[model samples]
Target: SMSVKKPKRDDSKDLALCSMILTEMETHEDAWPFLLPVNLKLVPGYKKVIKKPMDFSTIREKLSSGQYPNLETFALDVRLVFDNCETFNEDDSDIGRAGHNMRKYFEKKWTDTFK
Candidate 1:
């Protein structure tokens, strides 16, 4: 069975940090737009959406892999996608899951919309 869950972030800040990332993304011009929309849709209005221990280790692993692109490019990509992206909220796994789901949803939305 499938279930919907609340985001794992506090609204007191209204995703202030997230918005900062949004602002930062504007500079990349290539990666920021696509990645931000994907991340933002999950916690619209800056609702928290990551469980703690955000495990960027996976992404780090990806970066270290042979498949990793140039370090400079990788850094740009990282900032474009994560500059303000706080690690997943450790207290809430659903937030992380929601992020994944919403990212997919946004991508699909664009695909269908543009099509």
Candidate 2:
């Protein structure tokens, strides 16, 4: 057996908080465009502007896999998602609007759970 036991988190509280936040993001109405990696085939020139394409799917992976040693690093990656959005889309564009709203929602959740 290769690590037969289920994955265990060293910090259950942190995991739950982070997990809840990701759950909220996935359910957000504006999350459709962000649920998965940007479709490069559909959206041409996206790769040219966005260096790091972060999405809820990838963030969820980072959350479940215990990749970050510190909770702060986890937050860092989440912020990167919005940062890339802002960089690529204009404020009035649908994706850009989502980026702004999601950033606000995420920080609010972060402060409530961690502050």
Candidate 3:
């Protein structure tokens, strides 16, 4: 008797990367309220294809393969999102604080993981 073998490709790494991006976004202070929703809308061609209230599945799919490309691009895009969304209030204010937190997380925690 002969048995068929499945494809050799492994999605665990891809799933892990997607999970990391998701966790970061979900945990960020500003991501839920304004950052994430707004940024999802900011993605070119996404709003037209996707409806409101961006979900984990869509984010995971996009993170795995979409505009900007790769986790680093997505991380940098988040920083840019913070820059664009941040208000003119003091650095300690809500907007500023969120941006700072995201920046630190991306620069330190996220980047460090790759190193």
Candidate 4:
């Protein structure tokens, strides 16, 4: 196995990633209702891709390749979005506390098992 440097903080790319997640969620069915109650706008040109049935195995592929940076980012995003999402609704039940849980879930299923 080859060692690689950790990803550096890049402001432009970071902003773009944030934009994509926000836009993706606004139109997505799973995310839309939660975000809509909060009044997030369609990030111009944002089109919600209908969720195709998935086996969750796709997360495993990206996890194996270490290609899921946005996964990490959005996990963090959801934690914060939780607070914002809560502000709009009296019961903030669905805002996924995504980062800690999902990361552990994926890493255990993918990376940790190898150890």
Say which candidate scores most in TM-score: 2
- The prediction achieving the highest lDDT against the true structure is 2
Give a tens-digit lDDT track for model 3, residues 1-115: 2587776655346447646766876666665443335455455654454343333344555666654345565555555555553433358777667666765666776656654
Superposed on all Cα atoms, model 1 deviates from the true structure by an RMSD in Å of 17.9
Looking at model 2, residue 76 earns an lDDT score of 91
For model 3 the local lDDT of residue 35 reads: 36
Per-candidate TM-scores read 0.25, 0.84, 0.51, 0.29
- lDDT digits (tens) for residues 1-115 of candidate 4: 2687778655445444444444444445454333332212643222232122111233233334555465454344344444443433345245343323333343443333223
Better of 1 and 3 by lDDT: 3
lDDT of each: 0.38, 0.87, 0.55, 0.39
**Candidate 4: segments with Cα more than 4 A from true spot:** 1-8, 37-77, 83-115
Better of 1 and 4 by TM-score: 4
lDDT of 4: 0.39
lDDT of 3 at 107: 70
In model 4, pairs of residues that clash are none
- Name the weakest run of 10 consecutive residues (lDDT summed) in model 4: 46-55
At residue 42, candidate 3 shows an lDDT of 56
